[PDB]
Subunit: 220 residues, 4 copies
């Protein structure tokens, strides 16, 4: 196809540019053989993680799925987590959502989109979980609220995995973070849940949800 | 933690000098509401896809797992594919592997690393399926060869999903790509499997495997 | 070893008897090639589905997992459901729970048993969701109640699968059921959720959860 | 619908009979609280595991899926295994296949049946893995052989799980078995792969494949 030919062109261009440039990108990268952060984000990948964190190359270990979820029984995501924690020994796992999310929108949409709806049924359970609250908001607000709540709930799911617990239990150093950035700002905004142990996981989660429930006058 | 606070730091800075620079980044990015490419890469994420393709912001839909796999029964990945195809109408799906891959290395190591070992057993099955070839290969060369064969097999697995076959069948335009890049130079190299229908999938797959099976004395 | 040798011996004795008895069992089984009911039960398999229903051999298509769950993204169970519905054209899917379930007890337990805990986290989310009702209940009675609620919630998950809904949408005849039996008497008791359309799914689910919430002065 | 009513009618009849006719079935069942075997069979469930083994009620922990598979990354099946092994301390896991399996037939058919096709792609990979042997057969006889080979492979997958290997590594007693029965007679036939350690898994698997390849 045309787009592919061009894509390959853009790559060859950049690739050779470096080569002759005697750049050190491929040298720096090779010196950071091991990441120090696990990044769990959405497949929409609006603003890249490398852009948002300005970290050095090779510093991130990433996983992306629709609506950045951590489902209790998802072998795929759980495997990325376990490998990150038990093998790479990385000490920080970040879950990052984002406003105006297709996953979130699809979840709320009353339409059958095929296989994906099943995956999104987890989001809808989260929706009905905070129904009363979300119902107190204004229509144009519900979307971004769910996005924020979602991230809270995923961090909570992540902290309840046998993987994270056993890590904490053996005294291994590991912290869980859950932020959300706006596609227009690019500023990472902590959502409240940040665990370094199961106790801190429980506390921050309870608070994070309590705070989210305090609605500004903006919402009906 | 020191690393976290520092990360939040690098961000507020970058995002600030973007607002007080009237940059149109978040403006242009907003113009690309729907991606046109689905990128399935490795969690290692050595060289970002954004840097490899140098594409326009917001044009890539992305999924990443250990050793960029498309497991027949992986609900996570298949959901990404189905959403991209049936809902976003994306017409290009790329599977990208890379040299010096941890997943690949972990798969070849005998050590039981835990849960991740079950996930990597799919890679080990690929290894055995190409045991003759890989055996004839030199020790410090195998990893990179398996890395390339893995990409070929994943495009093959992707083209066999009911999601993709049904897409083609009902008359939807869609192509599958499988590339690999050396972490030392960042050059995207086609592994041979490219499909626009189930028929082209079969042909290019047989040819790709055939070619990959030709070993130079450089092993 | 012992247990295994005995089992094999039991099998031999049985099959011989059948052959010498000139039994018609197998020929009758062969008569029922396609099942008419999909039974989703617990791996505990306290009282076999065959004994509980006295159905003719081969009339049941079966799936069992810990705590008879229908998780939204479980490829195994959904594969069974889609095959039974889209291929076998089964019109009745029955989820069946039982009292004194090890999966339920483990879910409510506090010990981290390893991999299985993750699977059971779905049951714990159901435990918290109904925490008010359960807490307002007698401790020694909570397990039985969670077992009943679990079933109603699983039927609700089943009825929400893209698989079951599409079948109803295209006018295919299909009803869902959720029952529980006490391991002490074997009587199947309907839990209230019973659907033949998503309309009946919502209504019966609401009514079921409401009904279960009306406690008698005995906790 | 009538079918269901009849089903409920039967349950009551049987259960009622059990009570007044005073039966100790449930009492005996209650006695066998913990299972001693994990049975992984097909959802086709032609001849019930209870009828094939004629075991005491409550002795079996059961998992069933289409074509009795043990897929490396299936959270459902691995959870049953880990629970059975690490929690119930079961020492025997049995994978049982059967002739005339709808799962095997659908995997061989070149029809697109939907989601189930993705599940069966693992069977097709197995078919290709033994394409030399299987290709020397007619479609009919190929099904019976693939049925037997599938079981040998599943046992192999089970023995390669981190769950099973760890159990063996800490010295827990655990054996794996792969059998098949003809739906016309019900005789359980050992397919050859029997493991009590990783080494015996490798050897018996290789040996079993070797025997199965003799026509
Ligand atoms: Zn998103
Ligand atoms: Zn990699
Ligand atoms: Zn149970
Ligand atoms: Zn079968």
């Amino acid at each position: 196809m045309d787009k592919i030919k061009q894509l390959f062109a853009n790559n060859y261009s950049w690739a050779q540019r470096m080569k002759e440039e005697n750049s050190t990108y491929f040298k720096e990268l090779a010196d950071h053989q091991t990441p120090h952060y696990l990044w769990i984000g959405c497949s929409d990948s609006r603003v890249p993680a490398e852009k948002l964190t300005n970290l050095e190359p090779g510093e991130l270990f990433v996983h992306r799925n629709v609506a950045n979820q951590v489902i209790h029984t998802d072998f795929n995501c759980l495997s990325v987590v376990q490998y990150a924690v038990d093998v790479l020994k990385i000490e920080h796992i970040i879950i990052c959502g984002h406003t105006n999310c297709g996953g979130i929108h699809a979840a709320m949409a009353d339409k059958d989109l095929g296989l994906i709806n099943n995956w999104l049924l987890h989001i809808r359970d989260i929706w009905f979980k905070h129904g009363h609250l979300l119902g107190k908001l204004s229509p144009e607000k519900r979307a971004d609220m769910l996005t924020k709540i979602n991230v809270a709930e995923q961090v909570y799911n992540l902290g309840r995995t046998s993987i994270v617990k056993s890590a904490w239990e053996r005294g291994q150093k590991l912290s869980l973070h859950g932020w959300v950035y706006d596609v227009n700002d690019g500023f990472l905004v902590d959502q409240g849940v940040m665990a370094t142990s199961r106790e801190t996981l429980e506390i921050s989660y309870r608070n994070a949800i309590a705070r989210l429930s305090i609605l500004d006058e903006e919402n009906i």
